[PDB]
Design a protein around this ligand. Structure first.
Ligand SMILES: CC(=O)N[C@@H]1[C@@H](O)[C@H](O[C@@H]2O[C@H](CO)[C@H](O)[C@H](O)[C@H]2O[C@@H]2O[C@@H](C)[C@@H](O)[C@@H](O)[C@@H]2O)[C@@H](CO)O[C@@H]1O
Ligand SMILES: [Ca+2]
Length: 143
């Protein structure tokens, strides 16, 4: 049940379309965060940090890909946790399948107030777009 106080990101798009980082902090499958693609683009590295309302014991991250485009779809991730928002500890690394299905990332129970998702790999419907974008309809945490 942890509440996301806020989501911050490496970057966000509010100019070419409305896709701020906070759109990834609700369960509307029809809104998403997009890394900044409009000039000047931020083309990586990409990440997203959820600040929880308290310290929780967490063992799972849910990731809902953007539903209308594969652009930015996360296929490689590192998950880290923090108590103070500054010092992070890696708890999980892995790949995710290249489809729009909801993903889960699971690890041993760990106390966190902040959960960071580093995008190590991402896909695109563009020929030379590997790694350029990051999108998320939702990122959430569970314990
Ligand atoms: C094959 C190919 O090159 N396709 C591109 C496609 O990737 C582009 O989509 C947009 O790309 C930017 C980043 O460059 C963002 O991801 C945009 O959200 C994305 O737009 C979305 O998809 C398109 C197809 C439209 O439905 C748009 O309204 C969506 O938001 C488009 C640019 O429109 O061009 C090529 O089709
Ligand atoms: Ca959403």
């Amino acid at each position: 049940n942890p509440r996301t106080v806020k989501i911050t990101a490496s970057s966000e798009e509010t100019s070419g379309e409305n896709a701020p980082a906070s759109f990834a902090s609700d369960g509307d499958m029809n809104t998403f965060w997009h890394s900044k693609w409009s000039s000047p683009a931020h083309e990586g590295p990409h990440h997203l940090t959820l600040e929880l309302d308290n310290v929780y014991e967490i063992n799972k991250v849910k990731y809902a890909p953007r539903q209308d485009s594969k652009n930015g779809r996360i296929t490689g991730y590192k998950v880290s946790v923090s108590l103070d928002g500054e010092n992070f500890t890696e708890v999980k690394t892995g790949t995710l399948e290249d489809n729009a299905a909801i993903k889960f990332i699971e690890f041993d129970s760990v106390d966190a107030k902040y959960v960071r998702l580093d995008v190590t790999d991402s896909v695109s419907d563009q020929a030379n777009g590997r790694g350029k974008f990051a999108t998320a309809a939702e990122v959430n945490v569970h314990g």
